[PDB]
Structures are given as C-alpha cells and as structure tokens.
Design a protein around this ligand. Structure first.
Ligand SMILES: O=C(Nc1cnc2[nH]ncc2c1)c1ccncc1Cl
Length: 165
C-alpha cells in the first residue's frame, strides 16, 4: 500500500511526507511514534499523531502509564493505532536535548524488528536533537524488517537522500 518511496536498501524506504497524512492514507498495520518514557505526546511527531486521534492516543497512554509505569529510553510498547493504523508502536529514542545517551538509538531501532512492516519517523531526530543523518545510518544498520520512513522536512529529506552511503 506504500507509494512514492525511494528505496535505500533491501528493506529501508524513504519519502518526504507528513507521517500523519501518510498514516491516514495507508492505514498501516504499525505506525511508529517518537515517544518519551512518560508517553506525554506534546509536540513533534508524538504531538501531531496524538492530535490526529483527537487526544484518544493520550487518554490510552495515560492509562498505560498508570498501570505500568514509564518506559525505558530505548524501549517501546504496542498500543492502539486509533484512526491512523491498526497499532502504534511507541518507541523511545534518546533525547539529546535532555542529555540522554545517543548509544541507546540502536536499542530503540531494535524494537522495529518485532514487526514485519512499519511506517516510521527517524528516531531521535527533530526535537529529540540527534543528527538525522546518523539516525538513518543506525536505522539501515539495525532494522531488518520493512521500514517506510516519512521525513516531514523537504530540505532534510533531500539532504538525507543525497548524502546516503
Ligand atoms: O500536525 C500535523 N502534522 C505534523 C506536525 N509536526 C510534525 N513534526 N513531525 C511530524 C509532524 C507532523 C498535522 C497535519 C495535518 N493533519 C493532521 C496533523 Cl496532526
């Protein structure tokens, strides 16, 4: 169902797209959220995905945290995808702006290997403060399942493709 993606490797694909609009169109089995440990979906990709669910993602997430406690940096949980996907895989990449360890980015991408196909953003990019070129390199070298990356910013998309090794 994914269309218009540039193939980077055997299993990694990329497109300049808004992941909310992509999720509404494709209705994938799994959409990845760029989550934090508290599942507080305030801004970035998480704020956008939650807004698109009319805050239902945040209501479900607050119940999950009340029962289970916070996730680990590098960890994940599977929740509903609401109106966007069958499931949302909430993945916590390190937040460099909070001083978190960038070596946890590979552990974060390992969560994707539990799902055959995913629609995802680049982990730890955007407001999480990591270099998106590094994030794409770790993604290609860690994920073995089929990943469709949506990059919101056109200028960043072009730089990611042009500099891809
Ligand atoms: O907020 C939106 N997009 C958005 C914003 N900021 C982002 N950062 N990273 C991804 C992303 C996406 C939006 C646009 C159109 N329809 C629904 C929504 Cl919820």
């Amino acid at each position: 169902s994914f269309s218009g993606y540039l193939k980077l490797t055997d299993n990694v694909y990329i497109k300049n797209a808004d992941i909310v609009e992509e999720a509404k169109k494709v209705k994938p089995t799994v959409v990845v959220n760029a989550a934090n440990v508290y599942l507080k979906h305030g801004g970035g990709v998480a704020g956008a995905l939650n807004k698109a669910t009319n805050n239902a993602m945040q209501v479900e997430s607050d119940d999950y945290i009340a029962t289970n406690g916070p996730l680990k940096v590098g960890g994940s949980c599977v929740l509903s995808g609401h109106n966007l996907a069958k499931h949302c895989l909430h993945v916590v990449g390190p937040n460099v702006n909070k001083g978190e360890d960038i070596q946890l980015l590979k552990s974060a991408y390992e969560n994707f290997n539990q799902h055959e196909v995913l629609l995802a953003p680049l982990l730890s990019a955007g407001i999480f403060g990591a270099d998106p070129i590094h994030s794409l390199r770790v993604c290609v070298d860690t994920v073995r399942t089929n990943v469709y990356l949506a990059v919101f910013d056109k200028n960043l998309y072009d730089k990611l493709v042009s500099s891809f090794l």
